Structure formats: structure tokens, C-alpha cells
Amino acid sequence: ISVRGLAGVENVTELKKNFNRHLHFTLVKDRNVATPRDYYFALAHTVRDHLVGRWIRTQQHYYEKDPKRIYYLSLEFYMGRTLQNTMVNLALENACDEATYQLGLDMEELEEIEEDAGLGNGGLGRLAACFLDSMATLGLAAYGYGIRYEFGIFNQKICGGWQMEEADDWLRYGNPWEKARPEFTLPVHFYGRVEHTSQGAKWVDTQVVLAMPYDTPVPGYRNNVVNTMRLWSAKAPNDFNLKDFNVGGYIQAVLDRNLAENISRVLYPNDNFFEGKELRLKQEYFVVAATLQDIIRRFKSSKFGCRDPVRTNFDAFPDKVAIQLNDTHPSLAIPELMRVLVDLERLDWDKAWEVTVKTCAYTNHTVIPEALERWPVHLLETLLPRHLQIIYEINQRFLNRVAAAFPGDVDRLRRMSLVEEGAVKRINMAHLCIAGSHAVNGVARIHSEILKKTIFKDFYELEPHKFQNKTNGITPRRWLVLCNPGLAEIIAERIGEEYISDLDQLRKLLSYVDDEAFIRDVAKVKQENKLKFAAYLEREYKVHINPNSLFDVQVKRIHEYKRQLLNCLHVITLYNRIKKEPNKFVVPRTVMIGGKAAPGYHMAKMIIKLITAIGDVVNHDPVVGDRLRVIFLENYRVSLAEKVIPAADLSEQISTAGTEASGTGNMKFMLNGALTIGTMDGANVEMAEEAGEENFFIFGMRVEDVDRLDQRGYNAQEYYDRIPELRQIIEQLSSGFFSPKQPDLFKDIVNMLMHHDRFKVFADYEEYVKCQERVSALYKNPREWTRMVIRNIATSGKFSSDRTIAQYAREIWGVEPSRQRLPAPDEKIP
Amino acid sequence: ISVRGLAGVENVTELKKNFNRHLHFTLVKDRNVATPRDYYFALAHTVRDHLVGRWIRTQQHYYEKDPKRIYYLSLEFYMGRTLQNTMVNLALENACDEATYQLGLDMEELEEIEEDAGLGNGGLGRLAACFLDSMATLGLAAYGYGIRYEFGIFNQKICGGWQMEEADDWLRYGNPWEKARPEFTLPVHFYGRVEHTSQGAKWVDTQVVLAMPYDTPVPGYRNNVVNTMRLWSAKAPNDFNLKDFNVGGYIQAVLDRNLAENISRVLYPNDNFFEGKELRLKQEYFVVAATLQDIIRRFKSSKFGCRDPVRTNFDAFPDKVAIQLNDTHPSLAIPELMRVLVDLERLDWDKAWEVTVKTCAYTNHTVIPEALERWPVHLLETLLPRHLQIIYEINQRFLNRVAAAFPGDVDRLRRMSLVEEGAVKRINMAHLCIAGSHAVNGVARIHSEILKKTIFKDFYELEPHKFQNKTNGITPRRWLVLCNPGLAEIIAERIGEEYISDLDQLRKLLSYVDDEAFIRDVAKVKQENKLKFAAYLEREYKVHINPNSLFDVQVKRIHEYKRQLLNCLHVITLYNRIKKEPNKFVVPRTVMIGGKAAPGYHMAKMIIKLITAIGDVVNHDPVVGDRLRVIFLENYRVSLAEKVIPAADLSEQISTAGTEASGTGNMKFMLNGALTIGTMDGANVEMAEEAGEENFFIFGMRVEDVDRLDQRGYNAQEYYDRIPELRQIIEQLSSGFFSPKQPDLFKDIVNMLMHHDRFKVFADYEEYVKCQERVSALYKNPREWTRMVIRNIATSGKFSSDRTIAQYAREIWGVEPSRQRLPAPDEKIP
């Protein structure tokens, strides 16, 4: 059937009865009233059974051996479905497929019932998920810590061409994967005030919110390792949240509990955009405060909570603990770790600081200003009084270091301050992380260089040793084996299976670049993938596409910097050229654009309307025929990604040079047989470098060109004046060609493009369409297109998250990865 | 060990492995970190397994055979713990005891970990629970329908002698008994307006709240019948509760979902007191609307949703459906059933009314005015516009019936109206229920007579046939076998086990009234029960009592009509007499008073403070010694009831004649070997009548005496003037004898007693203490005390809820009870 494992005689039999056990005893249903949803759950529970045994021994193991623990703090974990992935990592796929088949059910149909765990916005959240899978696969004692939002990223609905947001009630039917652990609930404080008494400061009169943990297993790839992802849920104490007496109403007191519990209610739907709301700050401290108590408790036991030097010496804390900050969201971990160490454990400042810096590491994910976290002091002042005092003290000593290093450099001092003066004072969370971490890293080579050259230049000059780079990656398991079994199979037929956990081995595929059978095969799976997607499209969304055309897709969050607008300009151009010479042949294309716009991002929502507007015109022009279709992919999310990417021919990674930190979708397309048209931005540079620029479609300004243009000054009118095709498009938008009933509907877009385009869309227009012509040329030559594809796939090895994690492990955490199978799952009950 | 069933070889072995299965696979724990709470859950899940098989066949059975269905609508279901009760009804107690013993655990210690399902206030809620157990035991196709509050009756804490309320988070660790059924979610409407168009009225522009059902199994006693209790939970739709666009905030929209979900958040903590809050009315319509849709759906399938006359003829609705209204709380079921029938199914008014009256039955539970539900019209007008129109139309036609029956009786008309004029117009829910039901019943003989003679006199004259009586009862299983195995065993040793489901057989115990062995035994278990409680007291609450004294207990909600104050007066009297003649012998007594006060009931909370105040003085007077102890039993609830009742010698049922509809605690004490001192009120009359007045301690005014006094006019001063002992007590209260630091602390109590005592406490004082002297006299004669006890126990048979349900079944529902064992639980998987 494929290498989805063995369909053993004994195990298929065993699976079936357990499937039935759960259907009866767990779901309390009988075959005569069971629905596909019920069947999905019976299976989910059956599969979940297979990893609890392993989950328990793994955790027990780490308790015995006591290795250094890695704590990944992130406010986002874009998990997606977990049934299939679990079967894959446990080598259960074929057996389950067989068993469910014999039970008369279609496993694939059941898999579609699983709701996505959308606790993330996009790139940042998904990275955390790929990281977890890699850390488990590499045998690291790692823990993912976050918040269990009951409402993840909103589900997107297109009404009349506009995006409509609606709550993502992903827990409505329950989550068979998590395990509530109410017995490990911890308290978290808010507000209050600081008392300075005799021997130390005291955080007093605080409001308490309880943090209840929920564990979700994270299985490594076929190594019997199952790590844990702990998500915190907000709960109100039953005392004060009722006991603070003297009139108000008993009923009202109980109803008001949903005020402390709102903390974990919903994820902020912003991608690369900072919103300074109190609720957000509350979420950030909540995950930090709870997690740290858990971290220290585990440390206090270790082998110190037995003997060792005997005396809670936190000197070995950094040797046993490592906490990674996914961006600045969990930045309060630094001042909080100090608070605990100094205020509660009573360590001197300097000893506490040394420990903190040695255990904390910060990862930067963006350079755009509107995404940078700068919290107003009055907010920290009211909500976390002691933490503000600690930050000021950290700032004081840091700046003193600076003054000593650069005597007289008074401007440098204000520039490096963690505190920003002006309208309202703010705290620069990024500056805080750099100061309190022993390592700071970018997520791609160019992004990391930009940090040292620009944004954190002064910091780099002060402590050059702190700065590193760790190019992002993706997990080959979900992003290849899971979503594209067809391609994984033909690859395995030639080079084996060892590449799933050693993607570098994909290079061996280079020697088949001229193999006639392979070229035919690679081309076949892609054709099958395109047919399956073209079908899914009419199944769930309804209105036909042509599987023979070039599948041009751009899927990512909607942003001005991602330039979906540039993509739009090209599409309209193609249309106009066809309308000019109708009977001229052109390579057919189905351009698919999908992504979510943050609810408050007006422009982004305006772009979504433009896309659909274009499709309205283009898709109903009889002269165009099936040569050009414009489709907006609704509710783009992980599960949808697993469907389009494998079916894509052209991958669009067209951000303005210097704005996309790294990107990861790009990597997903490269590993799945799509060719990339893009700018020298983020990881695109390293991808072209790995596959050879001749096998990549690069165009547009490089970072330097962008800066040159900024010195000069960017004037869009120039481009409008010298390019007739471009002029024609702008006037079509301005006159209502795409919006008859509402002629001025797109005035904001036009106005912005001509007068305030922060991402110079026009500057890259000419080189972009020229380059697009080159891909169409190559598409006309199937054999060569596929051979170039083989060049990309065979050279994408470097972009596996196993490589990234191996690097974090050695160069930052100080731990050695291991591909050693944990001693089987075998029963055991001590 | 006892007759808690057989401890079979094969089954104890089977239990153990399943216990371990769940500990591992369900709880995801290993013996080395498992705590008593974990062990409790493993067991709970193991036991729950044994009734799913039966639960599924029972429900399937009712689908095949299709009998008349009984729907018990109540806003309260005081369930208490369900582990033990389930073992008892399934004959699993000894096997589980054995198995857990072999696993090295103490089952009893594990049982104490289970949280009480406190979805009730007192008598009314607990009745619904005993009824459910009886309906299952009698093989009726019955369904309990209610609301799944996430916060039940508050947990009571005594701080400085005052009651402190705190949220009862009973779901904190989960509920292993319920089964969420999200797939059966139904919509419920609110607000909106009524449109009258061509062919009918339309309820339009309503706000929708979703109702999610949760099923809990209700096992009959050893008959393999497992009925269902369906509890509704409020959930917000994800559309409009987000989709009603045009600014407000996406985040705020999601946080505001906890506004529609507040409906099922908390139970109103009032006992015999009406609060006209909108939230309450919302809860009342919510449970009614959702339940009815479920009732009709089931009917539409029956055997009509196949063939029969073919044509949705609701003529047979009453032949297949019976809905019982537990008080007026679910009264909206009447106008709602009309709305559906008329508005949606399009039946003519008269046909719809005939059907409604024929399927609905109403049970009255009180006669005090402050407990009667009278909803302001403006509230119904805004929240349920169409229902108000239906009520007015029902009223119109009803009054016309009256006018026709009593021509010219204009005062009768206004008196009987469902609509009350005055300050604000109100709807008399009681009048609505009487008009739209084919039967109305009281809960005790005297209560039922009072209804016909007083409160519903006019209604009784109009339709004498509607009025009946159904004396309350209690379940011998939980209230005897479960809480008092020791007494159940010795009873079984003599007369067998058939009495557990046929309590009338207890009469055979009369012939052992002179048996020397029995008298010794009955006296022994009571002594053991008193020792176990005296221990529990120091274990969980701490501060010693004497197990040789007479255990005088009064446990029920705190009310002015229940007269805990009268009990107080006696206690203070005993104290004063001892202080007068210290060296005179008196029968030692431990008077225990426990109960909860509604949060807004000032007087009730003042009484709780008085009780503790008395104990402060009495319990620390060296001259008193161990002859008199005053203890306030904290957080009285079902689980606590199961502990005190079996250990009680004297049961206090001292309400003012004519105020306690029936009472059920009284019955609990009678069946458990306690003697009753009380007034001729509620079921007390029938209990004395059953045991012979010579074996009961009756005192005080009868209903007639109370009325005589009211004609005359009640003047408390008279009693104060003629009774020195009474005067002495009042002046002790007035001078701060019981409240040194705050001398005027009890001025409200004294003032009320002297000037506005609605329950003439003083009028029954003299006869009460005189009578109390008589019980002390008899207590001094162990042999005779125990013989009188045997007379009560042997004659309590009539008070089993099996008898009550058998009566409801035959005289109201039109169904025949059956003690036929359902065809085993045996595997089966069709």
C-alpha cells in the first residue's frame, strides 16, 4: 500500500477490538446510531492508547536520568490535526487503514472530521509545532509551554467577496488528545503593590488567577519518545472571587468569575503586528508565571531534591535548565525569574542575574516596527508593579555597562535603553530580552545579518558573542510523508526510508535527475495531487478548475509586505494581454491566493476583496475560457495547507527584500515539487543557494537596491509614467472596471499604491512579470520543468527542522541530540 | 461481610485489571504517582463500565417496544455522590470492596473523595432524585430533564460564627458519570417580536442560545434498567454571537459569548422563596424549550415515524407522552407546547389545548406566599412576547369557562385570573399550571387538603376531578442500604432482602418487637453509628462530643417556618435549668443543628449566628460539663445527611402547623431508628398515623389552633408575660448574655419574636419543652426506647418513593409499574 508501516495480522485484529471497545464503553454508542464523527473518535482513542505507555516511560525516564531540560515558551502552537501524524510517528498508518477497512470504514473520510488545533496565527505558531516534533525526534528532554485558548484563530468566511470572521470553537466536541491535570494547578498574581520591608521587597494585595495545566503528547518519529506540550487554562479561585464580602450579589459574584478566566479565552489574531491591550499583557504574564513555577519545582527535585552539594544552590540551575523565548511574547520570564530568585529564594542580585542570563535565550522573528512590542509603563505599573521595578534596575545596571564601554557616547545610551521616552514611556521588550539572554538569534542568514547591521547594531557592538543565526526549517514528517505519501513512496523506492529523519539524504536523488522512470514518476504524483485537489475544490467549495493548467499559488497571511497586491497586478496583466490578443496561445494557469486578514487590518481586508473582485471579472469572461482562473482559497489553515502545497506547481514568495524574516511556506513548497518564483528575501536566499540559482526564479530588488531607493526617495508616479501596462491596470481600478456598482471601492488601494507604498510594489513590477514569462516558457517543456523540480527536492534537505533543532541544541542549549530508540513501549506497571 | 452482594472469584479478578487499565490508559498515571483522587477515578470509571452495556440496551428497548414516556421536568436534581449508589444498585459493592482491598486500598476512603452533585437546594431537589431512582427501579420509561449548572448550591463556611458562601466548583476535576452529547444540541430563542401574517403568528428576530445535552445514567435497583437524566448546558452560537457586524471589536465579541452561557452557570440558592430575576426566568424557559423539542422529536419517530394512521396526528401524543411539572418552575412548558402545536405544527387552538391539558400534570410543593411564582408582565413581554399572548388567550378562554359556571360571580373571576392586577401586572404561574394540566397534586394528605380548602379552593370547585394527593417518599436504597448497612443487615438477617424494593415488608419486624436479640442488635448498630459520627466529627471538623448522650438533631435549610429558633429556645432553657440546679441529674444531650441559609435571607443568617453563639456559651461552661453540647453542623448536604441521620436519636420536625408541605428528612430519620418529636404538620401526620401516636412525640398547635389564634390575633407579649422561663431567655438575648462584645447583636431576632412572628414560636414553647421532658424520660429506659424505635422502623414502609411513584404512575401517568428484570446486560454488538 505504501511504507505507512506494516499491517500485521495480530495488530490489525487488536486494533479492531479496541476500536469497538471505545465505541461502546467510551462513546457509549452502538453501531446502529454511530456517525462518522463517532467513528473518528473511537479511532482517535484507540490510537491515543498506543502512546500513553510510551508517554509514561519517557517522562519517568527523564526523572531517573535527569538530563538538562529544554523549555520552549511560546504564546502560539499551530498544531493542526493530530490523528494521522500520530499514526505516522508510531508506524500505525497501514494497520489502522487495514483495520478500519475491515470494519467497513474509510480512514481518510474519518481523518477529515478532526478539527484543527489552531492555537497560532501563522509562521511563528507553526514553527513552534515543527520544533516540538523535531525535539521529540531528536530525543531532547523538551517541553512546549503555552496557553490553551478555547478559541483559536478565527474561521474565515467570504461573504460577498468580503472576509467574515467567526469563532473557532475547536473544543465543541472535545479534544481526545489532551489530559487535564487539575491536580497541578498553580496560582498567578496580578496588580497589588510592593512593600519594602527590612529584609526585602514583597509583592502584596494581589488578585489571584489559577492556572490549570493540560498535557498533550508529542511523539517523536519512530523512536518511542513522547514529550509533553503543557497548555495553561485560566480558572478563578472559589474564595476571594466570591469571598471579598460586603454586598454586590452572590449570583453576580459567581457570574463575575468569567473575568479571570477570560485570560485564556481567545488568541489575538494578529500576525506581525503589535497591539498593546491589557488582556494581551495578562496572557503574556500568565503563561510565564505558571511555567516558571513548574520549571523550578522540577529543578528542586532533580537530584538536588535528594542530595548533591545540599543547599538549594541555583548555581547549577543553568546546567539543568534552558528556556527559549519564542520572540518577545514570553519576555517577562526574565524579570519574573529574577523576582523569584531575589524576592523569594533570596539570592543576591548579581548571582540571580548571572543565573538568569545563563538560562535564557531569545529568538527574533521580525524587523518591521509595527510588530515590535513596546509596552506603556503605566500598564506595567498597574498590573505588574514589582516587575517594573526589576526592569528599571536591570536597565540601570545595563546602561552603566554601556557607559563604561563607550564613555561619552550619550546618544548610544538613550538608544540602547530598555526604557523609551516620549509621548508615553514604554518598555522595549526586545532590548530586555537581549540584555537578559546569553544568545540572540535570527531565523535566516540575511535576517540575522540585518539584525547586527541595523536594528540591534549597538547591542552587537557591545556583546558580539550573543548574536547567532538559526535558519528555520520544517518537519519532513507532516510536510512530506503525511501530506504527500505518493512522493515519499517513489523517493523511498530509490533511496530508502532513512531520509525521513535525515533529510540530507535527499541529495542522492540528484543522480536520478536524468532517470527516465523517475522523471515520469515525480511528474505522475504531482499530476495525481493536482487531480485530488481539483476534486476537493468542487467537493467542499464548488465551481470547477482545470487540472492541466499551471497551479500558481500564494498562501500565507494577508499582509502589505507579503505583496499579494503584486501578485494581483500580474494577474490583471495576464488578463489584459489575453483580451488584447484573444487567439494567441498562452500557458493556462489557475492562480490560487489564500490567507487570513487580521480583523482590524483594513488594508488587508481590502486586498481580499480585490482578489475576489478580479476573479469575478476574469472567471466569467468567455474570451478567457479556461486559460485563466483566479481563485481565493478560503480559511487557509494547516489542514488546508497539507492539501494545496502538494498540488502546487509555482510557489509565490514575493515579499519586499528585507521584510520576511525567513518564511517557512517557501520550504514546504520546495520539498513538495513546486518551483519557486521569488525575491532575495529571508530563507529564499539560502534555498536558491542550495538548489543553484539556475533552478530558481529570482527577480526584483535585493536589500541594497531597496536602501538605495530609500536614499533617493521612492516615487511610484515614475513607474506609473513609464509603464503603460501598469498605468492601464491602475486606471482600471480607479474607474470601477473591477467594481461596477461601487466605482470608487478601491480608492484606498490605488491611493496607497501611488502615495504611501511602504513596500514599493511598483518597483518590482517589471522584473516580476518578465520573470513570470520565464516560468511559463519552462512549463511548456514538461521534461525540463520536472528535472528542475528534482533539483529542488533533492536539495531541500537543509530545511528540515531536525537540522535547526540540532543547531539550537549544540550552539545554544548545550545538549546533544540523539536518534536512539527509547527502550520499547512494553507494558510495565511498577 | 454483609449483603452488599457476592465477591465472586472471576469478577474480583476482572475488576482489578480494569481498575488498572483505567489508571494507566484513562488517567495516564503509574502506581508511583497515583493519589487517592486518582484511585477514586480509576474505580469510578471501572464501575461506570458496568452500566453502559445496560444503559444502551435499556434505551434501545424503549425504542423497540415504544411505551408511554414519562418526562420529569425540574430545575433541580439533588443527586449527591453516585459511586456507592451505583455499586449498590448493580450488586457490585462487595466485589469492589474485595478487589480494592486486594489492590491495597480502602474503598471507603476513596468514596469520600467524590464531590456531591449539588444541583438542588433541599427537599424539592432531593425528591426529584429519589423519584428518578424509584422510576428506574419500577421499570418506567422515564427521563429526568433539567439544567447542568456548573455551580450548584454554595459550600457553607462558618467564619466567626457567621455563614460564608463560596462557589461549589463541583466539575473542577471532572464528572466521570456524565456523557456530553454535543451532536444533539438544540437552539432556544429569546426576545424578538411577533409577526401576524396571513396564515399564523411568527416569532421573529430572536436571539439564539444553544442547548447542549449531557446524559447521566440512572440505574434501577438490581433489575438491569438504566434510565437517563438529561441536563442542558448553555452554549453561544458561533455565528451571530460574532457575526452581527459593524464595529464593537472581534475580541470583545468572543468574550461576550459568556453572556448567553451564563444561563446555566449557577443555581439560584433559594429554598421556598421566589426571586423575580430575568436570569431565573431565562433558566426556566431554557430547560423547557430544549426539552420539549427532544420530546416531540422522539414522538415523531415512535411508531408514527414509520406508519400508524400516517399523518402527524398529535391525537396520540398524550398516549405516548406525559410530562410532570415539579412545581411551577417549568410552567412555561404549557404555553410553549401550545406555541409549537399551534404556530409550527398548525393545529387548531382547541385541538392543541386538548392535547396539552391531557399530557401535562402539576405538583404543588408549598403554600407560603413568598414562595409563589408571580412574574411581572413586562418581563415576559420583553423576553417571551409570543408566550405572553398565548397566556392571555389561555386566560381569556379559562375565565369564560368560569363565568359560564358561576354566572354573576364577578369577584371569583378576578380571583381565578392567571393575570394579577395592581402595582405591576403579574402572571400567576400556579393558576396557569392548574388550568393547563389534567391533574394537580399536593405532597402530603394535609397539604393536599389545605390546597382544596384554601389556596386553590375556587379551582377545586370548578374542576374537583383535577385535584389529588401523592404523599412524598424517599428511596430505601440510598436512605437505608447505602447510608446504614449495619441496620439493613440485621433486618435482612430476620426478614430477607425483598424489602429493599418492597419496603412494606418492614412490618414483619413488628413480631420481633419483643425479641431480646433484635432489641440488642438494633440498639447496637445505632451505637456503632453514633461512634462513627462522633469520630468523623473530630476527624474533619475537630472538637469532641460524647457518644453516650442523646443525639438531638435538626438538619434542614434554615427558615423561619422550620423554627430552628424554637429549637434554640429549648436549648437555652436546658442550659438555664442546669445553671439553676447544677448537681441535679439530667439526660445528657448533644443537640446538632445544621443547614444552609439563602445568601439574601438576613434573618436566616442571623439565626445561624445565634446557634453558634449559644454553643460558645454552653460548650465552655464548666458547670455544664458533658451534659450539654450545642453543635452547628457545617455545610449540610446529601453526603453529610447520609452520615448524621443514621447516628441520630431524636429527629426535630417542628415547623408551625400548616407550613411544611410534607418534608422528607422526617422520613429519613424514621427509617434509620430515630424517634420523632414534632408538630402535626406535613407528612408527620401520616407518620404518626402509621406508627401509632403513642410511639411518636407530637406537641403544639394543630392547623385549626393556628387559625383560631389568627382570628383572635397573635400577641407574643402574652406568652412573655405568663412564662418566666421564656421571659428569662428573651432578656438574656436582649442584654448580650450571648453576645458580650456586641450586646445588641440579636435585637432583630428579639424584635421579630415579640412583634412580627409569622410563625408563632412562643405559642408552641410550653408544649414543646414539656414534650422534650417526655423524650428524656424515655431515653433513660434504653429497652423501651429501642422498642419504640422498632415500632417506627417496622412501620415506615409507606414512605418509600416506590409507593409514591407507583401512585403517580397509575393515578396520573396511566402506566403500570413493573419489577421485571431487563434481559441481563450481556455484551451484544449489532
Ligand SMILES: COC(=O)N[C@@H]1O[C@H](CO)[C@@H](O)[C@H](O)[C@H]1O
Ligand atoms: C512576530 O514575528 C513573526 O511572526 N515572524 C514570523 O516568524 C516566522 C518563523 O520564524 C518567519 O518565518 C516569518 O518570516 C516571520 O514573519
Ligand SMILES: COC(=O)N[C@@H]1O[C@H](CO)[C@@H](O)[C@H](O)[C@H]1O
Ligand atoms: C417550592 O416549594 C418547595 O420547595 N417545597 C418543598 O418540597 C418538598 C418536596 O415536596 C417538601 O417535602 C417540603 O415540605 C417543601 O417545603
Ligand SMILES: *Cc1c(COP(=O)(O)O)cnc(C)c1O
Ligand atoms: C507554514 C504556514 C504558514 C507560514 O507561511 P509563510 O508563507 O512563511 O508566511 C502560515 N500559515 C500556515 C497555515 C502554514 O502552514
Ligand SMILES: *Cc1c(COP(=O)(O)O)cnc(C)c1O
Ligand atoms: C432530605 C434532605 C432535605 C429535606 O429536608 P427537610 O427536613 O424535609 O426540609 C434537605 N437537604 C438535604 C441535604 C436532604 O437530604
